[PDB]
Amino acid sequence: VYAWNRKRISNCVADYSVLYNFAPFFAFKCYGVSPTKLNDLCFTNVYADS
Amino acid sequence: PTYGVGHQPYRVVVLSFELLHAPATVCGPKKSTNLVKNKCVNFNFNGLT
Amino acid sequence: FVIRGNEVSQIAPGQTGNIADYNYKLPDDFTGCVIAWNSNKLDSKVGGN
Amino acid sequence: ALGKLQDVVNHNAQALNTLVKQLSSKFGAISSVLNDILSRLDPPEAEVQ
């Protein structure tokens, strides 16, 4: 957690349906955006912090 | 593994985005429609409706 | 009905899921109560239910 | 010499301009664009925004 991994996401087409197709995710909490409208919005500044 | 919930390790990952303040590079499998001129249409340009 | 433990948040007005849009949808002006409880003792089998 | 009538015009158009500029205000919401709020959020939080 003190050295949390930050990964770039750019220049790709992301299918967020496979988040829900296979899902061990007990907590799925989005703050400023709908989860099912994630497939309809085009993004940059996408970061994955694990 | 013998501990109960409240002290078990959870893998937590945060996805961060931005909205519309920059050119976009990532979105979903929605397929493009052809472009029309001089016609009243509702458009979805990179998430901008 | 019987669903997964992580899908009990999806039985709500305006929520997002597979069971939300393809199996059971609630209206936006829905009033009432959702009751969700674990059924591991009855609705689960060691060989797979 | 004609400053009165011009001031009347310079009130009225300025007021209309200010009213147009009030559409760019978030008013405590995530965005000042309604279409962005519709395309970004579920309807229960779209109610609030």
Side-chain angles (χ1 to χ4, degrees), chain B:
Chain B
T2 55
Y3 288 97
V5 290
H7 295 90
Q8 282 173 27
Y10 299 101
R11 289 179 178 216
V12 175
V13 60
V14 176
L15 280 78
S16 297
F17 321 123
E18 72 94 23
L19 272 300
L20 207 67
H21 290 76
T25 45
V26 63
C27 42
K30 290 198 59 179
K31 298 286 99 176
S32 314
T33 301
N34 290 318
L35 183 63
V36 295
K37 297 274 188 151
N38 306 78
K39 185 183 287 185
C40 183
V41 286
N42 48 0
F43 43 81
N44 197 339
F45 278 79
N46 295 319
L48 188 153
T49 65

Side-chain angles (χ1 to χ4, degrees), chain D residues 2 4 7-10 13 18-19 22 25-26 28-29 33 35 37 39 42 44-45 47-48:
Chain D
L2 275 299
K4 297 188 62 45
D7 275 332
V8 178
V9 175
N10 284 355
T18 302
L19 195 68
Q22 286 301 98
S25 299
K26 311 247 172 185
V33 178
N35 284 332
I37 293 180
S39 84
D42 291 330
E45 293 83 4
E47 293 293 328
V48 182

Side-chain angles (χ1 to χ4, degrees), chain D residues 16-35:
Chain D
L16 288 176
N17 287 342
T18 302
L19 195 68
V20 160
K21 299 289 108 174
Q22 286 301 98
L23 288 185
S24 75
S25 299
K26 311 247 172 185
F27 291 118
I30 52 157
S31 185
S32 58
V33 178
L34 282 172
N35 284 332

Side-chain angles (χ1 to χ4, degrees), chain C residues 7 10-12 14-26:
Chain C
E7 287 169 340
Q10 293 173 30
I11 312 296
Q15 266 291 322
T16 65
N18 299 335
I19 61 164
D21 62 357
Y22 298 146
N23 292 263
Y24 183 78
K25 185 182 286 185
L26 278 182

Side-chain angles (χ1 to χ4, degrees), chain C residues 4-48:
Chain C
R4 279 168 57 158
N6 292 335
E7 287 169 340
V8 298
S9 64
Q10 293 173 30
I11 312 296
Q15 266 291 322
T16 65
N18 299 335
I19 61 164
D21 62 357
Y22 298 146
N23 292 263
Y24 183 78
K25 185 182 286 185
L26 278 182
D28 299 340
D29 49 347
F30 164 71
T31 183
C33 303
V34 298
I35 303 299
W37 70 97
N38 205 314
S39 61
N40 199 46
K41 299 178 192 179
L42 290 179
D43 287 328
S44 197
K45 283 187 297 179
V46 64

